[PDB]
Amino acid sequence: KVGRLIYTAGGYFRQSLSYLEAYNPSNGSWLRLADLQVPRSGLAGCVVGGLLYAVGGRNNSPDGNTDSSALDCYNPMTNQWSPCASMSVPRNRIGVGVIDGHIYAVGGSHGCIHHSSVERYEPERDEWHLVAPMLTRRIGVGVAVLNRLLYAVGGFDGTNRLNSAECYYPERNEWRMITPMNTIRSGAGVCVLHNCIYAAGGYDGQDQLNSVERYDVETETWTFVAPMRHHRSALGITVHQGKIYVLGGYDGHTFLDSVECYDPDSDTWSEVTRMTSGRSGVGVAVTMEPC
């Protein structure tokens, strides 16, 4: 269990960013690691087999605004990025989840197109294949996996921001709606802790949110927990050693550098570190420290 870092890839501040930086909760340190080959905001991160993957996003720069179909793989042992097979379609404001060593890419936008499509990557074959689409088009969608089921939470369908959520059952290649959240959320941080899916922050169409709610997959209810100290949309999120970490985002005024940590036993959030610069729209995941 020792030696794991929280990696943050990409993001946005004035333009899309190429940063890869890693935080060590055990000593408070940050490391700046190899830049992404292509800057991207609105991407997702995940880990399979000790390797960090950056999926989708958009490169917003002074010279263009290009949605990404890319999958790139970072090896901590070499501090190098390598390209992998690209997805069927560009997906900005994507969500991803991992089931049994496979990466699921969910939703996202391509220009004015709001995807319901979903595709699955096989690392051993370096291949993507489309699976059943969601029941709803969703960009800015939060995705997480619990008990080998994939959840897609909130987002924006092209007309309305959403409180709805749905679950993918892989053995039936089928999506079904679940109970909707209490709050409309696009750009929330979504993760899994114990037997619940958490949705933290986001934008409800009017304001960035500090509220946090969790879906108990047995009882099918959403319950609010303690709110974050900061309102935040387009935040990064991960779980590490039984606590939720939220990174950056936008509070309606500032691109935040603060990182907050949720302790479920006390139902409290605390500020634990600051990123090296404020940013939103990052991808976050946990893996071993680099060489």
Ligand X SMILES: COc1ccc(S(=O)(=O)N2CCc3ccc([C@@H](NC(=O)c4cccc5c4-c4ccccc4C5=O)C(=O)O)cc3C2)cc1
Residue 90 binds ligand X, judged by CB under 6 A = no
Among 74, 151, 250, 269, binds ligand X (CB under 6 A): 250
Residue 19 binds ligand X, judged by CB under 6 A = no
Q: Please say which residue, 157 or 166, places its beta carbon nearer to ligand X.
A: 157
How distant, in Å, are the alpha carbons of 17, 40, 92, 113, 183 from that of 63? 14, 14, 18, 22, 37
Report the first-to-last Cα separation within the chain, whole angstroms: 17
Counting residues that bind ligand X (by CB under 6 A) gives 17
Structure tokens at 129: 């294949």
Least gap, CB of 79 to Cl ion (angstroms)? 24
Residue 172 dihedral angles phi and psi, to the nearest 5°: -105, 0
Residue 42 binds ligand X, judged by CB under 6 A = yes
Among 2, 62, 111, 124, binds Cl ion (CB under 5 A): 124
**String marking each residue 56-95 x if it binds Cl ion according to CB under 5 A:** ----------------------------------------
Using alpha carbons only, give the angle 283, 287, 291 rounded to the nearest 5 degrees.
110
> Which amino acid is residue 120, in one-letter code?
R
Three-state DSSP state, 112: coil
> Quick one: what does residue 233 bind among ligand X, Cl ion, none, with the CB cut-off 5 to 8 Å set by partner type?
ligand X
The candidate with the shortest Cα–Cα distance to 68, out of 47, 39, 48, 97, is: 39
Residue 121 binds ligand X, judged by CB under 6 A = no
Nearest residue to Cl ion, scored by beta-carbon proximity? 124
Q: Please say which residue, 12 or 198, places its beta carbon nearer to ligand X.
A: 12
How distant, in Å, are the alpha carbons of 173, 230, 266 from that of 200? 28, 11, 17
Least gap, CB of 78 to Cl ion (angstroms)? 21
The candidate with the shortest Cα–Cα distance to 11, out of 248, 171, 253, is: 248
> Quick one: what does residue 74 bind among Cl ion, ligand X, none, with the CB cut-off 5 to 8 Å set by partner type?
none
Residue 100 binds Cl ion, judged by CB under 5 A = yes
| CA–CA gap between residue 167 and residue 149 (Å, rounded) | 7
Residue 283 binds ligand X, judged by CB under 6 A = no
Residue 179 dihedral angles phi and psi, to the nearest 5°: -50, 135
Residue 187 binds ligand X, judged by CB under 6 A = yes
The candidate with the shortest Cα–Cα distance to 20, out of 43, 3, 49, is: 43
Contact set with ligand X (CB under 6 A): 12, 41-42, 60, 93, 140, 156, 161, 186-187, 203, 208, 233-234, 250, 280-281
Q: Which residues bind Cl ion (CB under 5 A)?
A: 99-100, 102, 122-124, 170
